[PDB]
Design a protein around this ligand. Structure first.
Ligand SMILES: OC[C@H]1O[C@@H](O)[C@H](O)[C@@H](O)[C@H]1O
Ligand SMILES: [Cl-]
Ligand SMILES: [Cl-]
Ligand SMILES: [Hg+2]
Ligand SMILES: [Hg+2]
Ligand SMILES: [Hg+2]
Ligand SMILES: [Hg+2]
Ligand SMILES: [Hg+2]
Length: 272
């Protein structure tokens, strides 16, 4: 459940937070609109796990696996079982054009998977009654470390691993005024990834609905955003600030970017 009566936490023993000792001194851990930026070292997962378990939180994880992308499902699901929201209720939603091609992956208790053929006979209304949060990611990836409730919030975006240190002028936002995804050179907070975003079901549906309409307008105007859905997602998150921003630890490509010291963990990565 979400947004309800929250019971008291039990007695817990952990290191006292130090007011005069910054969490991380090498990175920004909070945005100008007071949304935390999630980096390793900023959170005590035991406290967060307690908070979300006491709420009987259910997380939905959605992926689209079309054509040859169905080949990525086995590794994706197997690693998700080892690193994604372990201990919490998880409902995987696999949208594919090849239902019979979905691998039979063994799931831990309290976790289930639904295969939706695709456009589809699945009404978004179902998400509202089955899960509390929705996490939307790409399938040609693998989890390599912890990805848990620390990411849960009404609406979150993830910093693109190739632009987290870039100035806004270098961001590959759609720069044509004729597009609904247009963002001028003097605007923009960060460059978010289209491949990893989420939040409450309500907020995720609001975002996808907004982008769907924006892309339809562009289509009618004979224009296609430079980076398609990702371009519109950036425009949306610029005008509707996310309540949490995930660091590049959450979507990295070690082949193209290595393992910088600023990244204490590589949690979700592209498959070579
Ligand atoms: O500049 C944006 C682009 O960056 C590339 O590295 C990535 O492969 C694309 O999917 C898109 O995100
Ligand atoms: Cl997605
Ligand atoms: Cl998705
Ligand atoms: Hg800290
Ligand atoms: Hg989604
Ligand atoms: Hg949008
Ligand atoms: Hg869209
Ligand atoms: Hg979008």
């Amino acid at each position: 459940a979400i947004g309800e009566f929250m019971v008291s936490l039990p007695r817990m023993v952990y290191p006292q937070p130090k007011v005069l000792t910054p969490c991380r001194k090498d990175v920004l851990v909070v945005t100008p609109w007071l949304a935390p930026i999630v980096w390793e070292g900023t959170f005590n997962i035991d406290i967060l796990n307690e908070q979300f378990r006491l709420q009987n939180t259910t997380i939905g994880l959605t992926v689209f696996a079309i054509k040859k992308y169905v080949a990525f499902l086995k590794l994706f699901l197997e690693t998700a079982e080892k690193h994604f929201m372990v201990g919490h209720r998880v409902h995987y939603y696999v949208f594919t054009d090849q239902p019979a091609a979905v691998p039979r992956v063994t799931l831990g208790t309290g976790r289930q998977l639904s295969v939706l053929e695709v456009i589809s006979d699945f009404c978004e209304r179902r998400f509202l009654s089955e899960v509390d949060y929705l996490v939307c990611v790409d399938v040609d990836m693998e989890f390599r470390d912890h990805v848990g409730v620390e990411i849960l919030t009404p609406l979150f975006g993830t910093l693109h691993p190739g632009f987290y240190g870039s100035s806004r002028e270098a961001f590959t936002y759609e720069r044509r005024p004729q597009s609904q995804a247009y963002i001028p050179k003097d605007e923009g907070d960060f460059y978010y990834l289209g491949g990893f975003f989420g939040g409450s079901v309500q907020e995720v549906q609001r975002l996808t609905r907004a982008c769907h309409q924006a892309m339809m307008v562009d289509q009618a105007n004979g224009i296609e955003a430079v980076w398609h859905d990702e371009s519109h997602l950036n425009k949306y998150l610029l005008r509707h600030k996310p309540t949490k921003v995930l660091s590049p630890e959450y979507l990295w490509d070690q082949q193209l970017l290595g393992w910088p010291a600023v990244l204490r963990k590589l949690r979700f990565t592209a498959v070579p």
